[PDB]
Amino acid sequence: DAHKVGLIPVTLMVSGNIMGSGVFLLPANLASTGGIAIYGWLVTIIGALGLSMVYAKMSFLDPSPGGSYAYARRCFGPFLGYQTNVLYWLACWIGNIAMVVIGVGYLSYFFPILKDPLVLTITCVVVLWIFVLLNIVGPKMITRVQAVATVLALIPIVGIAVFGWFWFRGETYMAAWNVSGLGTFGAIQSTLNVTLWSFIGVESASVAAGVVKNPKRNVPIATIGGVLIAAVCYVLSTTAIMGMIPNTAGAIVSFCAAAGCLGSLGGWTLLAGQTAKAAADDGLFPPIFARVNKAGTPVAGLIIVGILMTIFQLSSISPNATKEFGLVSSVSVIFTLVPYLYTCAALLLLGHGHFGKARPAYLAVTTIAFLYCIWAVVGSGAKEVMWSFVTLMVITAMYALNYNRLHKNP
Amino acid sequence: DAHKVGLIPVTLMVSGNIMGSGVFLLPANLASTGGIAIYGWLVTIIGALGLSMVYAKMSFLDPSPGGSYAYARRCFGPFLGYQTNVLYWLACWIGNIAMVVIGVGYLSYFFPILKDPLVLTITCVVVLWIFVLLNIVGPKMITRVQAVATVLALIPIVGIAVFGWFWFRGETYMAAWNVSGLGTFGAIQSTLNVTLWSFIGVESASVAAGVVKNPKRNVPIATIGGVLIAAVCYVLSTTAIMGMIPNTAGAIVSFCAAAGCLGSLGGWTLLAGQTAKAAADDGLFPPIFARVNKAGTPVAGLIIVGILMTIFQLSSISPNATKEFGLVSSVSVIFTLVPYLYTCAALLLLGHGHFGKARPAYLAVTTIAFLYCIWAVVGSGAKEVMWSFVTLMVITAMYALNYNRLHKNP
């Protein structure tokens, strides 16, 4: 198959959905800290790379076509995996509405603007279907969108990596040094708590399956590529941290950031159609989507995701926490963790005896992945989390929509 | 079998674990409200009776011998059910330490006393093993303890039901009327939020199985008996609500309350040994307990529960929230919900097509049970709930202790 994309724009997708709509804000987020504190990066990147490794050698096997639910079919995988879906896709199109309220806030000036009245919302609303239709064109086309746009948002960051390496200069960062944070013991927390729940994305590769070239080779290479990429991106970019704290070619840096939300948005609508029109086939949901107009792609799928997406775009217009951490926009963050959980549960529930040799080695990386996934939700908002769990209780008993499973019957 | 108890002291067990260590405090808990507000009772009792009905017609089938995990073997039932255990048992012996810090605070005077220094703790510590050994004697003996002691704590409440019906008098309650609460719309919340998470217990019957007479008949009758009992107990007792708000034979009323924690404590250590030395056999945990010295009963089991119970009795001595809602003593409240959840999931996952006729009827009661269970955790402490969920993530990835399940393998 050649109408089914490949590594080159896949790793870019995978990377650029972590990159991605949070880097041009990351330094800011550890400015109110607590700043550098590079340690925070050390540990969050080590454990996250572990998570990407998990995903790598799992899609190394059954990709999938999901994934991150594919493997849920085998912590169980009915109930638990059909759940894992609801709560991930329902955190797939939801996290999108978040993505536009910021992505267009990134073009809040520089032509248009406007961008303050009802115009902000009317444009995020039409900016979404942009990518919905650009998925009805794909999937090979939406990945073509992401490739160009994120290598656009790569200009800024990568530019500061080496070029920023030649500018500043120098011992200024040494001047600001650590401190501000309330000491090393927990000081890290002030950084981890914003480099962690913001490494979210490694899934996209083992979630493309159904439209990557060769899964068993390209996809594992995809996540590991994506993670090492965004990772050094993160470090070299936010090590450009001299002393400031207050929060010509400037226009390019402001355009290239929104251009990350140019590719991202497509990417996540994509992930939205995938891990759902997937558990359409491996069983139930229910669907509906389907219906997969000939040549792949969920025609009903992404269109339906459009309706679900737009409906919330016009009532979170608007209050819901006017920015990040919105009791709805953040919870959907937590949601995307469970599938991190069962996955790693699976890269061992399906190495029952490992169709691969040397145990302890894989045995660590998965444990590490478990800290990372457990820690980055252990240390987060108290209304938000209880919330996820409320959704778990409700996802569950919303399987009355489901009286036909089986196992260990009577 | 006749060394295996029967309905007569079983329903008393089942009832007196909800009764039970919260009634002589219940009116107090809706005094700071918001008081009567009898509605709160209306809705909490209707949905709870639904929950008991759920449990009734489930143990009507497979009892079990668990239960409330028995049936988990069939939302899955490996991982999910072995979980459902950890999080219920670890909420079974934990809820106990809570039970003694109050049950002896109930004899904080009237002989002994003391009851304020290190003596409070040294006595709760030895008061626990009391029931641990009185379970090593049972299980028919511990139920004999609960029967006598709760029909002792029945004297107070039931006495006010009819006798209290002849005393006051009269329109005083009409004088205090509703109000104080911030209006009907949500006013109920101030009552439901303390009549709900305080109806916990209906499980005990469908959790005795392994030591009730005939399961299929006695156990269903047990929970429904238990619930209607504690229910009218609740209503007729806390309808003795005249106007007061500040918070000879008086000694009897103060003794008879602790005497509820005389029987309760035994009951829950009991439930502790049960839904664990049960998932010892249906599979894994791991155990250990076992080892079931001849004639039933988990000898290693309750003894081990003693060590786990005493260890926390001497470091929650002491701070941990010096009373109810202890971020550990309350969470373990939330924990005892999940098994409520999968249960009701099961009275339909195992009525796949109902080995019983007329669908919609059973179809409601289970839905109602789902509200009750979901609502009473939807509306509770924010650190506590996120906490349960953290335990869910950890229960989970603590099944590395478990690399040998199966289903839909590769």
What are the boundaries of each domain within chain B? 1-410
B195: three-class secondary structure by DSSP:
helix
Query: CB distance B377–A393 less than 8 Å?
Result: yes
Query: CB distance B393–A373 less than 8 Å?
Result: yes
Which 248-307 residues of chain A touch chain B by CB within 8 A?
A: none
Cα B384 from Cα A75, distance rounded (Å): 27
For residue A110, which amino acid is it? F
Cα B85 from Cα B62, distance rounded (Å): 17
Nearest to B390 among A61, A378, A407 (CB): A378
Say whether residue A345 is in contact with chain B using an 8 A CB cutoff: yes
Is A96 one of the annotated binding-site residues? yes
Q: Do A383 and A93 meet the contact criterion of CB atoms below 8 Å apart? A: no
- Residue B78, phi then psi, degrees to nearest 5: -40, -115
For residue A39, which amino acid is it? Y
Cα B326 from Cα A4, distance rounded (Å): 55
| Residue in A with minimal Cα distance to B338 | A393
- Residue B394, phi then psi, degrees to nearest 5: -85, -40
A101: three-class secondary structure by DSSP:
helix
Query: How far does B108 lie from chain A, in Å, by closest CA?
Result: 36
Nearest to A389 among B62, B352, B386 (CB): B386
Is A197 one of the annotated binding-site residues? yes
What is the number of alpha carbons within 13 Å of residue A247 lying toward its C-beta?
A: 12
Cα B163 from Cα B174, distance rounded (Å): 20
Angle (nearest 5°) at CA A62 between A59 and A64: 90
Cα A103 from Cα A264, distance rounded (Å): 9
| Residue in A with minimal Cα distance to B410 | A350
Nearest to A73 among B345, B377, B408 (CB): B408
Cα B159 from Cα B150, distance rounded (Å): 13
Question: Which chain A residues are within 8 Å of B386, Cβ to Cβ?
Answer: 380, 382, 384-386, 389
HEC string of B343-365 equals HHHHHHHCCCCCCCCCHHHHHHH
For the record, the structure tokens of B366 come out as 């289970």
Query: CB distance A403–B342 less than 8 Å?
Result: no
Nearest to A121 by CA among A327, A322, A324: A322
Which residues, 6+ apart, have CB-to-CB distance to A382 below 8 Å? B382, B383, B386
Give the CA distances from residue A370 to residues A46, A54, A335, A377, B133, in Å, rounded to whole numbers and listed in that order.
Answer: 12, 10, 15, 11, 39
Say whether residue A341 is in contact with chain B using an 8 A CB cutoff: yes
| Residue in A with minimal Cα distance to B364 | A400
Burial of B213 (0-12, 13-18, 19+ CB in 10 A): middle
Is A52 one of the annotated binding-site residues? no
Is A388 one of the annotated binding-site residues? no
Query: How far does B397 lie from chain A, in Å, by closest CA?
Result: 6
Nearest to A383 among B382, B409, B410 (CB): B382
**Rg of chain A (C-alpha set):** 21
> B69-99 burial by CB neighbour count: b if 16+ within 10 A, else e?
bbbbbbbbbbbbbbbbbbbbbbbbbbbbbbb
Number of C-beta neighbours around residue B367 at 10 A: 16
* Residue length of chain A: 410
Question: Which chain A residues are within 8 Å of B73, Cβ to Cβ?
Answer: 408
Say whether residue B401 is in contact with chain A using an 8 A CB cutoff: no
Is A21 one of the annotated binding-site residues? yes
Which 44-103 residues of chain B touch chain A by CB within 8 A?
A: 61-62, 73-80
- Distinct helix (H) and strand (E) counts, chain A: 19, 0
Q: Do A170 and A35 meet the contact criterion of CB atoms below 8 Å apart? A: no
Angle (nearest 5°) at CA A249 between A245 and A255: 80
Nearest to B403 among A341, A348, A370 (CB): A348
Beta strand residue intervals within B173-308, DSSP E: none
Instruction: Please count the residue pairs, one from chain A and one from chain B, whose beta carbons lie less than 8 angstroms apart.
Output: 139
Which residues, 6+ apart, have CB-to-CB distance to A139 below 8 Å? A4, A5, A208, A211, A270, A296, A297
Residue with tokens 């999080």: B87
Cα B144 from Cα A41, distance rounded (Å): 60
B113: three-class secondary structure by DSSP:
coil
Which 359-378 residues of chain A touch chain B by CB within 8 A?
A: 363, 366-367, 370, 373-374, 377-378
- Residue A179, phi then psi, degrees to nearest 5: 55, -175
- Residue B38, phi then psi, degrees to nearest 5: -70, -20
For residue A285, which amino acid is it? F
For the record, the structure tokens of B397 come out as 């990835």
Cis amide linkage into residue B22, ω under 30° from 0: no
Query: CB distance A377–B390 less than 8 Å?
Result: yes
Say whether residue A346 is in contact with chain B using an 8 A CB cutoff: no
For residue A236, which amino acid is it? L
Question: Which chain B residues are within 8 Å of A344, Cβ to Cβ?
Answer: 397
The experimental resolution of this structure, in angstroms, equals 4.0
Say whether residue B345 is in contact with chain A using an 8 A CB cutoff: yes
Number of C-beta neighbours around residue B249 at 10 A: 6
Cα B37 from Cα B24, distance rounded (Å): 18
